[PDB]
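We were asked to recover a plausible sequence for a given structure. The inputs and outputs are reproduced exactly as logged, with field labels preserved.

PROBLEM: sequence recovery
POSITIONS: 259
GIVEN STRUCTURE:
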């Protein structure tokens, strides 16, 4: 990837290390590719430069259909990490914009796609820590991709977190399972924020006493049941993502049959 082939267009957001720009990359074939170009302040420590660059070193290895894609890296100053840009943007806002036209089958599809990504992470004992619809991008109506690009960060959102994460800052694959079911609640609620009726400080109290997020109107009952299993207080009683894939695939086929 040569710098002359990357054209920057507008600020996408601020990341931890520097601004992130929307851009266009023209590849060796000559096609134009929408990219998110991540930058790093020049005055950062060697450690922070290493951390910044480590994203590209890691992500080069990820090629899952439901994980975001690293396009490339320009190592020379100014050092740029070039991620694929998904013009549809975040799933939460996508759902908000499209509530009147989306079918439940499609909501279950997205849940299963993310579950498959997470089962892959579980297979290598990696944890996400920030599973939420803001970290999922829509590649197309038929395809979502999981990212990890929130300003906290290879491995707080209180209203998404397991009780052990809230109480002890403990984060395991089992706590990701809890967070993933919250993400599913967001999907099935067309982007509503979980516990929007509470302040962060009230959340643990509610969980300790046995209260949970109510079933979204459109959520199939069997899917709500799975959600509630992911919200078992005891991390040992939550399913593994690997087995959840099987459970979700069953819900998808039940939903596809009735459609
Ligand atoms: C050091 C380090 C840092 C991050 C990671 N991980 N880990 C993961 C897992 C595999 C999911 C866990 C993803 C990841 N990186 C990213 O998601 N990067 C990314 C995405 C974006 C936003 O892109 C957009 C936004 C809007 C529209 N279009 C595109 N910015 N940066 C790994 C190592």
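RECOVERED SEQUENCE:
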């Amino acid at each position: 990837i040569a710098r002359e082939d990357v054209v920057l267009n507008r600020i996408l957001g601020e990341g931890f290390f520097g601004e992130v720009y929307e851009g266009v990359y023209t590849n060796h074939k000559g096609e134009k590719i929408n990219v998110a170009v991540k930058t790093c302040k020049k005055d950062c420590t060697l450690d922070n430069k290493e951390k910044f660059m480590s994203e590209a070193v890691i992500m080069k290895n990820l090629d899952h259909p439901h994980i975001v894609k690293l396009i490339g890296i320009i190592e020379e100053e100014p050092t740029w990490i070039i991620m694929e840009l998904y013009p549809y943007g975040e799933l939460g806002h996508y759902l908000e914009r499209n509530k009147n036209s989306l079918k439940v089958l499609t909501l279950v599809l997205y849940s299963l796609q993310i579950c498959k990504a997470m089962a892959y992470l579980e297979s290598i004992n990696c944890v996400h820590r920030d599973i939420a619809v803001r970290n999922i991008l829509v590649a197309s109506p038929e395809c979502v991709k999981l990212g990890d690009f929130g300003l906290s960060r290879d491995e707080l959102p209180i209203k998404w977190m397991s009780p052990e994460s809230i109480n002890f800052r403990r984060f395991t694959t089992a706590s990701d399972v809890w967070m993933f079911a919250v993400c599913m609640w967001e999907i099935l609620s067309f982007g509503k924020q979980p516990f929007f009726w509470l302040e962060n400080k009230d959340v643990i109290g509610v969980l300790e006493k046995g209260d949970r997020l109510p079933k979204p109107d459109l959520c199939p009952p069997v899917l709500y049941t799975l959600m509630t299993r992911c919200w078992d207080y005891d991390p040992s009683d939550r399913p593994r993502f690997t087995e959840l894939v099987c459970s979700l695939s069953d819900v998808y086929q039940m939903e596809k049959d009735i459609a």
